[PDB]
Design a binder for these strands. Sequence first.
RNA 1: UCGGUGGUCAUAGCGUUAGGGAAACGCCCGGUUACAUUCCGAACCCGGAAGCUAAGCCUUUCAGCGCCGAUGGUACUGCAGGGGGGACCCUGUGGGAGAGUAGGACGCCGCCGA
RNA 2: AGCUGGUUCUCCCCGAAAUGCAUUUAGGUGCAGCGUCGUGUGUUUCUUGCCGGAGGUAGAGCACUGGAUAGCCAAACUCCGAAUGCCGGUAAGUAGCGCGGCAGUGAGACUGUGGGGGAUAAGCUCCAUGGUCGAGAGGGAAACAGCCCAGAGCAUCGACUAAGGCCCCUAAGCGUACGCUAAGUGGGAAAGGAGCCGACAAUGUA
RNA 3: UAACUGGGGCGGUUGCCUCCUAAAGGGUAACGGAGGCGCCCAAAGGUUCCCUCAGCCUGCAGGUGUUGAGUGU
Lengths: 48, 126, 137, 175, 58, 72
Amino acid sequence: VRPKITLACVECKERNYITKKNRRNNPDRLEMKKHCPRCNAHTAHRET
Amino acid sequence: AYGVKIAKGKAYKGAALKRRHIRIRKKVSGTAERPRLVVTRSNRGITAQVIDDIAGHTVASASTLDASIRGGEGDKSAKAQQVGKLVAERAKAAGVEAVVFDRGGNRYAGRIAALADAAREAGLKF
Amino acid sequence: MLIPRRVKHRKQHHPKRSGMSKGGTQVAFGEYGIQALTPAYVTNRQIEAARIAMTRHIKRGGKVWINIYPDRPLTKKPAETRMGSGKGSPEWWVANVKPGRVMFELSYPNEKIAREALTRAAHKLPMKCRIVRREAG
Amino acid sequence: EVKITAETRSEFGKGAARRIRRENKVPGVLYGHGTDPVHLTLPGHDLMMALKTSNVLLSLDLDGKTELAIPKAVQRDPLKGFLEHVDLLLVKRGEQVNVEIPVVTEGELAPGGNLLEHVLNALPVEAEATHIPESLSVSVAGLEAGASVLAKDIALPKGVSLAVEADTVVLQVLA
Amino acid sequence: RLKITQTKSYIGSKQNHRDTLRSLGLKGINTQVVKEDRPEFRGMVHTVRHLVTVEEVD
Amino acid sequence: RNGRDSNAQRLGVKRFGGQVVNAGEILVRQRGTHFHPGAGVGRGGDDTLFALQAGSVQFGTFRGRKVVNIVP
RNA sequence: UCGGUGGUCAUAGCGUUAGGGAAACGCCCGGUUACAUUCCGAACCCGGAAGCUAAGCCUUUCAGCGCCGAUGGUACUGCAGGGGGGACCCUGUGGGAGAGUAGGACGCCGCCGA
RNA sequence: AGCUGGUUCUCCCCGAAAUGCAUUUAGGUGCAGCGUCGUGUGUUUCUUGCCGGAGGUAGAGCACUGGAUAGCCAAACUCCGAAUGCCGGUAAGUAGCGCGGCAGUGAGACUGUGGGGGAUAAGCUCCAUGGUCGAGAGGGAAACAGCCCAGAGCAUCGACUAAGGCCCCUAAGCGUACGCUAAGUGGGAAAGGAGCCGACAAUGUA
RNA sequence: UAACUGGGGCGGUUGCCUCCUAAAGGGUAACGGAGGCGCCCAAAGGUUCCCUCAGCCUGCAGGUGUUGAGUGU
């Protein structure tokens, strides 16, 4: 029910973080902002 | 300290402010390097003292009872500017550079912002 | 027959029996009382048998108080069962009576009949008992 | 007033007291009126004969000094009944103290299955330390079931007043 | 000063009782040691009061 | 249906009064705040009390609540 | 002699009884803007000073409820022994409560400002 | 063969274990605990006094939860709360630790105390904390591994004692003085009844 | 073609968390006494600011109420 998602921003195209998120609660592809170590910036990581 | 009780009708202003003051004093203590900078906000004027809670003594102090402010032109907001300036001076004198501001329970706006800014431009680091 | 209508834990340890009574050593309600002299467990059956003895003997008038209540559960496993495999189900309800405890109380106009009724009860109990009169504090 | 000879206790603790009772003496302590407690040893037999009476006035022949005292609290063996400890309270001639007096009921209840319950074994009253009545007498004759006698229903002797609220029940009659 | 004589065997006594006797210097039945009257030694005697006899000597 | 238990956690006080400690040592392991952090004492993620500065451990009552304290 | 800020955390509290306005604190009257109300300038925020100690606050009486509380003893107990058919009971030496009693208590200790 | 049996000369020094975790594991084994030897350290070990600490057991109590006719009850109730024990400091008094070689042990028993299961059973069973046996000779309890006294290098035709005893068997008292027992109690037992009764199984006193 | 097991089989259990037994540090057994877990929340996380409940009494409002409510489980 709660699968493991892999976050990714639009620049580094490197899979940084993974997390749990209830599918039925958040069907829309989840998104937030993290610290990408390649980019060295606080960019936005759209769920893969 | 250990908080105070609640109140009913009258004395609710006093209790709520005091209860709020305790909330602020569970993370703001008067050290030796940076003392406390309590600021009481009454109806007439606004006082501000520099207390050392670890020792218990007070280092500096200023209010509207001093001659410099006692009687003059300006509303309260501009009247706190004098109080801010002196206490900064009376703190610089007795070897104080960095202090920890506390609201006293009342919100940070109006005079409390104005008093802080007047004290902050005089050298003290908040 | 006295049973607790509700008890938090059905299965309990054996109530220890060292020491004297915490309290209830003196006549409180009635004029005469039964004071224990040795420890024992008094089952709800034993209390009932004693109560009938006193009330039947006096036959009318007089009032009997039962100061102890059998609320401690004792357990017993099914017969001819080997050791182990859990604890048994409660069977007897016992009041942990220690030396000095005043168990039964009785008020009656006639002293001789009172003592006789009290003695008849004592022989239904499993400990040594003594008859005590209410001290005029 | 009862004259009793009393000696001073110097050894304290579990072992000392057990030896004292083994010698058939009752340890005691005399206190009151802001004085330092005086630790006493008492003759066991003379004590029990004296203490048969409630609130008996004792004149302690203490080391050639006579002092007035009243037994305030006494510890007895719960099973054997011999005295173990006495607390003696100082009282001077003519001062008021609060004491408990037993109530003795006079007369015979009205005929029937009526029973008398002593809700309070002893009635608390304040009385002069030297003129404490031995007991308070109550007339219960003719009473029926449900009838309850209040504290204010007790006919006190002159000089005695209640130390409890006037509405407290002392006696009751049960079916 | 205290003159301490051991009168009973250490066999059957607790381990700390054995060490108390050793610390006092006692090493068997009928052995003696002389110590100063100090709170430590009064305490050691009390711990093994059933295994030793103490005599006061100037 | 009995016979289940959770293996022991070894909670309790790990440094007692008068005990000299170095900064960061564990003073108390506990569930909830039976002891609150005092001067020079920090609270961990799981209520653990650890010294922030070297000193001697000392218990007390600050502001009406039992606390641990480190005295340099 | 009062206002601000601390420590102990009821021996301080609660209730009850008589009062106080010199500065101070507060009530207090208004919403123009900044600011705010799950709706209301009641609260926060803003600007003053008409009236007032009625309440808050401070002082004060009462041991009434609550609170604190010895000494002595007892239970209990480390060590060492006894007794009993058993459940268990007792003592020597060291330690020693809880309850209860006599009593205490209508707080105390700092720093500033008027 | 995780199994059974056997393994041969002597003396000197030290000297255990039957416990914890895990285990296709339970009568086996790995690691840790406990032994010994070498090497480095040197009082660091241990005992007692004092000092600084946290507690929630025994006891007690009803202020919370529950039971229950003003009096009461409670492993999973606590307004309270020791004695001990534990951690650290220090003083006095007399083994500890690091690094390596080599092990055995991991079937425990009874007795004192605090408990659980059992039925207010068991020479029962499972724990905690002492003692002895195990691996301990010698003296006592008639005999009687685990109880009381006591730790055997060897010799001794000397002495004093411990537990336990002192009429004869059998070493030492027909001891001195006061009092109790009439039942051979001593030399087994209950509720209960007025030292006694209650008292009662099988080879032969027993 | 498992083990535990008051012989073995039958029945039951096997990992983790909380309480009591557990003898006031820690640890401590039994096929001892009670229960839960194999998740959930994109906020039920972070921070800043603000508020105090349950219950009771009176006719949403008022008085009382310091923890007896709540704390995802």
